[PDB]
Structure 1
Amino acid sequence: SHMSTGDFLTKGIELVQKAIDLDTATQYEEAYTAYYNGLDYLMLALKYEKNPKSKDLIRAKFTEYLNRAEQLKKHLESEEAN
């Protein structure tokens, strides 16, 4: 019922670029949310990608942003408990 016309990869990148700006600004709450939004799009880009070289690059970048988002989350859990 909806055609999936847009590029999930470039949407994911758009959201990660925003996350990076927020992360740099120490706006970690907002950055964390931006990262996970970006990652949901990159995960779908990965699931549906048919070029193995492209999949390899998407995987490498996904992992990097996921590592960072996980760090932010632990930090926020720490501030929340304290």
Structure 2
Amino acid sequence: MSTGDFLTKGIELVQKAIDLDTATQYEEAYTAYYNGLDYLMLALKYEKNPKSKDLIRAKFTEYLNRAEQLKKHLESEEANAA
């Protein structure tokens, strides 16, 4: 269990999320993004270079923001149609 391994798995998972996102499978994408965020968070915890930590944090935040945008979109769409 190393930061590189965690990054590899995180990026795979976020790539999956992004594929589901593009496919408009937003509920599944939301879950997949957060799966990805778990591993980016683990990578962050085991990384000691402060520049690399901030790089990972910046990407974490980008994926977090997208996930929350999907969530808001899902909820608002449902509320509009209720």
Q: Report the TM range for the smaller structure's normalisation.
A: 0.7 to 0.9
Task: Decide whether aligned partners of structure 1 residues 11 and 26 sit closer, same or farther in structure 2, where only a CA change above 3 A counts.
Answer: same
Higher relative contact order (CA 8 A, sep 6+): 2
Q: Percent identity?
A: 100
Structure 1 unaligned segments of length 5 or more: list them. Answer: none
How far has the Cα of 1:80 moved from its partner?
4.4
Task: Decide whether aligned partners of structure 1 residues 5 and 43 sit closer, same or farther in structure 2, where only a CA change above 3 A counts.
Answer: closer
What's the C-alpha RMSD, in Å, of the aligned pairs? 2.1
Could you state the TM-score of these two structures normalised by the residue count of structure 2?
A: 0.83
Query: Which structure carries more helix by proportion?
Result: 2
Secondary structure of the structure 1 residue equivalent to 2:20:
helix
Would you say the 8 A contact 2:2–2:43 is kept in 1? Answer: no
How far has the Cα of 1:78 moved from its partner?
2.6
Residue 74 of structure 1, aligned match among 68, 72, 75: 72
Structure 2 unaligned segments of length 5 or more: list them. Answer: none
